[PDB]
Structure formats: C-alpha cells, structure tokens
C-alpha cells in the first residue's frame, strides 16, 4: 500500500522494540522478568582463520565458544559465536567485522548480531550487541550484551554484562529476516558507523 | 557522562549514547509518513553512472561507482539533482549476494538532504524497488525525514529510474547535526527498508561464501 512509502508489515513490531530498549537503559540500574548478569568473566576459546596471512584483513573469519562465569565462580551460561572481517571503511580504513552469537542458559536461549570496528576493540573499547531472546524464559526478552577484552588476555578473557528483560506479549519475532531487522534496528543505538561520508563524495576502497 | 544516556558505573551494564532519545523520536515519524510535506511521485530519474571494477570481468568486492541523477517530474520540470556513491563490500555468507553501501546528497532549489543504506547487488538485478531513508540537511528540508524509493526502468536500467521522494517536517526538527548521530539515524531507519547484511547460515559459521 502506497508505492511512495512501502514499509514491511512487521514495521510496527520493530518500532515497539525501541521504547522498550530505551526504558531498559533506565530500568537497568535497579513486575517484568528481568535477567541481569553483571561483572561476568567470559572465557573465550577463539579459532581465527586468515585469508592472506600474516596480515589481518578482509576475508578473515573466526568461531568461538565462551563460558560466562559470575564472580562467585558459577557458570551461568555459554555462547557460540562467528565473525567475519568484511571490508575497510572508505573514511579511515578501519577493519569492519560482523558477528552473530547464540547464547545458551540452563533454562533457555537468546541471540545477538552486530558490527565491530577492528581499530576500536584493539584499543580496549566496550563492544555492545543487542540481544533478542529465542527460547525459555528469555523468549519474550530483548537486551544488551556488553564485553571488554581484558588488557592481560584480550582474546581469551573478557569482562561481560548480559541484561535481558521481558516486554509485554514478547517481541513476537520468529522469521529470521524480521529478527535480523530487529537486531539492525537496536544495533543502530550501540554499533559503529559502517561507512561515514569521506568528504570528497566518493566511497573509494582505501 | 557527556556521551552517555545515564552516567555512572551502575549503567556500565547498559550504556546507550546521549542522543538515543532523538533517534527513538524518528521511528514513529518515519512510520507515520505512509499516510510542511514535500512529495514527488513518478519522477523520471536521469542517472549518469561512472562504474569501476577491481577484478573484471567478474562482479565482486572492490567494485564501486559515482552517479549524478536529475529528478524530472512528469511535466518535464527538473525538480532537483543527486550525487551518489556506492561500494561492493562483501559476499553474504548465506547465499553469496553482493552487499553494497551507498551515500547520496540531494540538492533542490530550496535546500538539501542526504541518504545512506545497504543494497543487495543480486536483488537490484531482479528490478526490485530500492529504498533509502532521507534526512534533511539544509534550507526547507533541514527539519525533515523521508524515504527515497527507486526502480531501474526495464527499457533503461543503467540510465533511467522511476523514483519517488517523500520528505516531511518534524516540529523542532530531527535535531541531528554531527556525522555520528546522522549515520546512526540513517542506520536506525534503514533497518525497516534495507536488506539483511548477513543472515544466519544455519551451520553457525559466517564462513566467506
Ligand atoms: Br589472549
Ligand atoms: Br562519501
Ligand atoms: Br555508583
Ligand atoms: Br552464522
């Protein structure tokens, strides 16, 4: 309806996520089911593949398994992830990587995706991915995964938070295209710029 | 505190940028556009494409372009112009489609606007509609958001597009000035209209396809 302004049927379901996500930022300081796992130690086992070694660059990819351990030493959950180094930004040649992760808790599942700036994370910045719950008590939830690689061991130990909270009637997304759209919508708030304007009005490979 | 929505270490577990509420404000507005309002339906978009390859003959990552467009209404009046640029960046893991990122600057007699967003190169081929969010940048359009929708014409898919432009004022405006906020806004609205940047492959391995 309206060739002029055709938005997909799922648009209201995506839009509903945005006030919930901002409300989570204010409620995540202290009704709904709220899962907060603060100050986790994330033990990562990383398997990196090089396209054209010994240089990190486009075509590199990795898989990883994470165990999430709370300060009391208890495993609260696991994660399986995969990332691909995709391109260098036209503006400053930063390596842009995309990740997809599957989280497993004792009583359910959730997933993330998002962009990482290669330069930023080597400097010790926080990385943040939006979470959509996919099963168990998490299925009706949205949230945020925040990790910082420890300066001691930046590829094996991370400091990590996981925050998820129920939204009324749930996010209602099951189709992988809607889920991906939801993860991009929320990722806009927390993710790096994919390709800033260069100034010369040209997106040249650097 | 200056960069974040709620300052202090108690908010390290859920840190959003300070501009998050302005970004959120755009979503209801964007959804409302369907139903000061500038509309241009059934424009003929005359496109002068300048297309480069990196490993001809094959279409792949490193291919890029610049294009100049003229927007001509049905009566034959030039109502504005556009300068665009695009890059083929990678092949999706799932189905190997060529993912491209574009950035465009729109010039009208009475102001300016900008777009950015993803294109599935392997879907423009099928003559599907392409949609980019618009943010006003100056003059009449400075306070507006909108949508650019174009389809290459069958008889001339390299040089003539059928094009719609909708821009509408938000009261007090969108209140984005800095490239970081502009890019995030284009990315937030782009989630509704752009292609999936890398669908889950099923085998849990974003391996190069
Ligand atoms: Br390490
Ligand atoms: Br540019
Ligand atoms: Br405190
Ligand atoms: Br995957």
> Which CATH number is B127's domain given?
2.40.480
Question: Does residue B5 form part of some domain?
Answer: no
Question: Does residue B125 form part of some domain?
Answer: yes
Q: Among A5, A188, A203, whose Cβ lies nearest the Cβ of B64?
A: A203
Tell me the structure's resolution in angstroms, rounded to a single decimal. 2.0
String of DSSP letters for B7-46: -SGGGTTS--BTTHHHHHHHHHHHHHTT--EEEEEEEEEE
Q: Among A22, A177, A193, whose Cβ lies nearest the Cβ of B183?
A: A193
Structural domain that includes position A121: 32-190
The token pair at B190 is: 């782009």
Contact B38, A22 (CB under 8 A): no
How many whole angstroms separate alpha carbon B123 and alpha carbon B131? 12
Q: Is B39 in Cβ contact with A28 (below 8 Å)?
A: no
How many whole angstroms separate alpha carbon B46 and alpha carbon B158? 9
Is the peptide bond prior to B172 cis by the omega test (within 30 degrees of 0)? no
Q: Among B39, B183, B198, whose Cβ lies nearest the Cβ of A4?
A: B39
Contact B134, B114 (CB under 8 A): yes
Residues with their C more than 2.5 Å from the N of the next written residue in chain B, i.e. before a break, are 35
Interval between CA B7 and ligand 3 midpoint (Å): 9
How does strand B130-139 pair with strand B144-152? antiparallel
Interval between CA A49 and ligand 1 midpoint (Å): 16
Query: Which among A23, A24, A34 is positioned nearest to A140, based on CA atoms?
Result: A34
**Residue B193 zone, left/alpha/beta (φ > 0; ψ -120 to 50; rest):** alpha
| CATH number, residue A174 | 2.40.480.10
* Contact pairs from chain A to chain B, CB under 8 Å: 193
DSSP B76: S
SS3 content of chain B, % helix, strand, coil (to 5): 15, 45, 40
Question: Does residue A3 form part of some domain?
Answer: no
Best mutation target among B35, B66, B191 (most A Cβ atoms within 10 Å) is B191
All residues at 6 or more sequence positions from A73 whose CB lies less than 8 Å from its CB, including other chains: none
Helical residues (DSSP H) of chain A, grouped into ranges: 11-27, 118-122, 176-190
When divided into structural domains, chain A yields a total of 1
State the CB neighbour count (10 A cutoff) for residue A29.
11
- Bridge partners (DSSP) listed for residue B133: B147
Question: Does residue B170 form part of some domain?
Answer: yes
State the CB neighbour count (10 A cutoff) for residue B180.
15
Contact A5, B167 (CB under 8 A): no
State the CB neighbour count (10 A cutoff) for residue A185.
23
Place of tokens 């919930």: A20
Question: Does residue A83 form part of some domain?
Answer: yes
Question: Does residue A21 form part of some domain?
Answer: no
How many whole angstroms separate alpha carbon A171 and alpha carbon B193? 19
Is the peptide bond prior to B67 cis by the omega test (within 30 degrees of 0)? no
State the CB neighbour count (10 A cutoff) for residue A48.
14
In A, minimum Cα distance to B186 occurs at A188
Question: Does residue A65 form part of some domain?
Answer: yes
**Residue A200 zone, left/alpha/beta (φ > 0; ψ -120 to 50; rest):** alpha
Query: Which among B177, B118, B184 is positioned nearest to A193, based on CA atoms?
Result: B184
How does strand B144-152 pair with strand B160-169? antiparallel
Question: Does residue A206 form part of some domain?
Answer: no
How does strand B98-108 pair with strand A95-105? unpaired
How many whole angstroms separate alpha carbon B194 and alpha carbon B185? 13
Query: Which among A64, A68, A75 is positioned nearest to A161, based on CA atoms?
Result: A68
Shortest alpha-carbon distance between residue A61 and chain B (Å): 7
Contact B102, B117 (CB under 8 A): yes
Q: Is A188 in Cβ contact with B23 (below 8 Å)?
A: yes
First to last CA, chain A: 41
How does strand A141-149 pair with strand A127-136? antiparallel
Query: Which among A44, A42, A47 is positioned nearest to A61, based on CA atoms?
Result: A47
């Amino acid at each position: 309806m309206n060739e002029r302004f055709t938005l997909p049927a799922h648009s209201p379901a995506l839009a509903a996520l945005v006030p919930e996500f901002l409300d989570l930022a204010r409620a995540a300081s202290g009704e709904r089911d709220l899962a907060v796992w603060e100050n986790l130690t994330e033990h990562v086992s990383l398997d990196y593949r090089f396209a054209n070694p010994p240089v990190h660059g486009p075509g590199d990819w990795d898989t990883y398994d994470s165990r999430f351990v709370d300060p009391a030493g208890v495993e609260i959950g696991t994660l399986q992830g995969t990332g691909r180094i995709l391109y260098e930004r036209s503006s400053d040649a930063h390596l842009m990587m995309y990740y997809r992760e599957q989280l497993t808790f004792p009583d359910g599942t959730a997933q993330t995706a998002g962009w990482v700036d290669g330069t930023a994370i080597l400097g010790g910045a926080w990385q943040r991915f939006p979470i959509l719950g996919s099963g168990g008590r998490y299925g009706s939830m949205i949230g945020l995964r925040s990790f910082q690689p420890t300066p001691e061991a930046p590829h094996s130990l991370y400091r990590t938070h996981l925050v998820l909270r129920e939204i009324p009637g749930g996010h209602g997304l099951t189709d992988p295209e809607e889920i991906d759209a939801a993860l991009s919508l929320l990722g806009a708030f927390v993710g790096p710029s994919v390709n800033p304007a260069t100034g010369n009005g040209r997106l040249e490979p650097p």
